[PDB]
Design a protein around this ligand. Sequence first.
Ligand SMILES: [Ca+2]
Ligand SMILES: [Ca+2]
Ligand SMILES: [Ca+2]
Ligand SMILES: [Ca+2]
Ligand SMILES: [Ca+2]
Ligand SMILES: [Ca+2]
Ligand SMILES: [Ca+2]
Ligand SMILES: [Ca+2]
Ligand SMILES: [Ca+2]
Ligand SMILES: [Ca+2]
Ligand SMILES: [Ca+2]
Ligand SMILES: [Ca+2]
Lengths: 244, 262, 267, 268, 49
Amino acid sequence: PITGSMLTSTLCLYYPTEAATEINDNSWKDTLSQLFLTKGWPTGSVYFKEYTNIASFSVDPQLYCDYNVVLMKYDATLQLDMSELADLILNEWLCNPMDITLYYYQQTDEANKWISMGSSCTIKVCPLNTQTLGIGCLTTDATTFEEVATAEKLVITDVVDGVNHKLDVTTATCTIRNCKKLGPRENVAVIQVGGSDILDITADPTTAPQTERMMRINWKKWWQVFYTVVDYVDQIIQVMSKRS
Amino acid sequence: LPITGSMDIAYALTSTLCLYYPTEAATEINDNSWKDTLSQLFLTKGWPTGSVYFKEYTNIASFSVDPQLYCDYNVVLMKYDATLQLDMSELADLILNEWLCNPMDITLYYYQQTDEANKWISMGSSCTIKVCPLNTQTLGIGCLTTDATTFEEVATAEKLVITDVVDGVNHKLDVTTATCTIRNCKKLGPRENVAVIQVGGSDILDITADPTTAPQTERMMRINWKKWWQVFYTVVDYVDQIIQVMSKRSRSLNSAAFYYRV
Amino acid sequence: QNYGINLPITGSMDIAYATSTLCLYYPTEAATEINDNSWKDTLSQLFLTKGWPTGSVYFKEYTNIASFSVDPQLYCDYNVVLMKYDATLQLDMSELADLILNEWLCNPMDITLYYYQQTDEANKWISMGSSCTIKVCPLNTQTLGIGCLTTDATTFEEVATAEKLVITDVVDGVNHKLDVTTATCTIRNCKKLGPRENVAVIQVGGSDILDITADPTTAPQTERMMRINWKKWWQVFYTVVDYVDQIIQVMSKRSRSLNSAAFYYRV
Amino acid sequence: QNYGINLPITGSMDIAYALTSTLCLYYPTEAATEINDNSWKDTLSQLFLTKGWPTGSVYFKEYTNIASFSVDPQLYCDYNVVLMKYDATLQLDMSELADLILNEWLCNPMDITLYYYQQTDEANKWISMGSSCTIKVCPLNTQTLGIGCLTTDATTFEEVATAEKLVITDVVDGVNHKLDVTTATCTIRNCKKLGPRENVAVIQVGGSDILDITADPTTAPQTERMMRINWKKWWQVFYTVVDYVDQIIQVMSKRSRSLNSAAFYYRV
Amino acid sequence: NSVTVRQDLERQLGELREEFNALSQEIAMSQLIDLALLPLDMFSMFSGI
Ligand SMILES: [Ca+2]
Ligand SMILES: [Ca+2]
Ligand SMILES: [Ca+2]
Ligand SMILES: [Ca+2]
Ligand SMILES: [Ca+2]
Ligand SMILES: [Ca+2]
Ligand SMILES: [Ca+2]
Ligand SMILES: [Ca+2]
Ligand SMILES: [Ca+2]
Ligand SMILES: [Ca+2]
Ligand SMILES: [Ca+2]
Ligand SMILES: [Ca+2]
């Protein structure tokens, strides 16, 4: 209960391999470090992380920084993948293990989802009635299970709440967790390089919020993209809170 | 009549839902009992068995031919294609809104649009509408009233068209009446019975012919998708929110039609 | 002298109080599809019903967004530009929309002799021409390149290639050497003053993709930026004519400038 | 700060109130050819510096002829001084050029293949510029039928210009006209004379004072910015300009339209 | 001798009424009372139109 009266941070920039390949310069990280230094960031505070693709980045993304800015190149065929990654890295998740081989799982409320990551995650679900028998599926035979994902690097599965499910995830190359969305992760911001402003970070179908940390820029040159980010770093930082 | 309330007083199972979906959704699901499964899940959510009716349409264009929404609440899962933005917008404008329509006899009379709320809605197998504006002396402007080849074409083999011409000028129409019917429709307001869920790309529905407004009503929803099973689980799991978004029809009465009620 | 801009205006909160020209810029695609010799005459007649007297509505045709971006001209009191969405030209559409919708004050930029720097967030470098190729080399306080030798332009960091219109934004407060292809391009140092209510943009097709601010944290959608779904150019033109009242009401003709240039030039 | 309105300005009649600009000098190629010195622009720049103009503030623009210069004479400069050489056979050309560069014109487009045009006021003219303008007009009676001309046939039109680089046509006000401009090379605009342009001054270097910048035949005003000198040496002409730059600038003034208080009054 | 010249389209009646109503601002009460006292007839009403 708080009563009121009415230079020390690190920044990370996560960019695709395409940006570096186009720039085709060996010392562009050093160039951007000097430019950030002019903008007021002491040398040794700006880091540049590279990821091959959105799909590969979605496999357990680690964002160790006081501020994180993720440049995400748009693709029309990957809107769901972009939305999944954006939700995962823009919201805080409290996750617990899931052992499909041993227990049946259900989702308690709207905050509960099943987040699965790995090389290839094929998830099939069989809902069970109160008597523990598959609805439209047979527990013994997994070929009848309804398929909710297929060879996905990241999946955020939502199923009807209050009904037990038997899962048949491909745990050989995937790991699935029972996660709860605690709230927003102000440490991370996403800038969509080109596209059409398509990101649904809420599983609810009646809500597609556009928070301040979700940005979109039209682009034709990655050098222009990076110069824009450096020039308006102050605005990007002001748009997001601080935490590591 | 007046309805007087109070701003201090503390005030302290019988409806049907219809899900309209494309054929490819069922084709991908490929489970003969998927409708029964969804019925049981809706029951878990609190919808008695038989209260949910599933309707299958083959395409947006085909569904646009006289859409027949016959539930207390209707949810239309409309897939997105970047080449069908106008078609999706027309279908959304048709169903999400209430239109008072009267028949138009193009082959006899000339017609005009009274105000911004009035348009010409054409439906059928193939609507090829051509128009010719007329002046006060019934002579065509930029067209010859007798030669229909000179008319100006506003549609081409369309399953559904919502045409809007300049108000206060008579027009002569050459719509193909054999495979199409055109009606003079005045938009009354919103049809709260129906909600549209765009399962696909960006939010592009412009349900107002006014170029300055593209309002995004609460009943126009959008979801990214990769599996129809996931789409349907989303709909079932958030049915409460969708119903809260919708409301019961306030239209007093119109032409009789079949409904799926309790 | 100054129209008394320094003086105040006192208005009451209770007292009851209760030939403009219209330019229509459209692509050649529209004319080709319309395929009529007198469609301009037809639209003039139809505008006459909405109240624009004959001789007040003019129709300008441009082959492409790219070509129209080469020194666009604003001729009428109300300039409505129909822009055809193309998924591969989003940045070009954004740059053209920024240039026309916002007022700019530009100064000459002799690049063969002088280093240049952006001063504040309102300053940009606007280059226009048949082919504008821009390579920038930032300099440190010692006037040495950062990641690029000053003498050799091949080490410069490219920002635009064979572009009809470029709005370059570099880091403010750092000098740059620019190897801009001045043979077919002219680059000027511009500052954005404010909105230009004289001009409105109507995008046919697409999915509402226009950022008219260099700031990445802001993509404002003013009232003069409109979008419509389209399948017949006759339908598009009838929509514009029938709703010209709303479009004009959203616009304002006091921003009419003396010259048709999209920017104010100061030497 | 209160742009776009006209608030009365109040001042006192009994109170005592006890460089940065840029000058552009337009001259013909004949001047440079006669001077025949490569560094003459640098020399004039140094002399202007002596007079008080920081180096780099004086621009020297060269035009080949009055006729060529008349094609869109863009003068973007805090002060502009145009030395135009008198020619006995170019009096109307000189007057047209002087009017165009000495008055402010608000111009609207003209699509002569869609509309008939009438001039509604004494300040409304048709200004056409380009490689070759050939304006042929047909006045129309109230039936949209030509008067003394055939609306269908252009050869019967009455010609008011022939291969003119610049021309300012003035027809009888209030009557519709059908035009046959050669738009393939020349562009015509419906212009209205807002008022004087203080940025520009014209020095006629040669014969007598013949410029008149008013269509009205009853008046031939000779304003402050219309100067005239005799000459036999372009070096002498330029020395005179440099020496009396202060007088020229005092006769001129900063462009009212480009003042940051003209916002929403047809500039800035 | 030519094709029939189509009469120009007049105006949208809604906006015509809007402008006519907007004209009520430019009305002076005393002069309007004088004009009301003057009996307009088939001649006076249409003479100056
Ligand atoms: Ca994914
Ligand atoms: Ca099954
Ligand atoms: Ca759930
Ligand atoms: Ca025609
Ligand atoms: Ca359609
Ligand atoms: Ca209409
Ligand atoms: Ca380099
Ligand atoms: Ca460009
Ligand atoms: Ca900048
Ligand atoms: Ca001349
Ligand atoms: Ca004659
Ligand atoms: Ca005249």
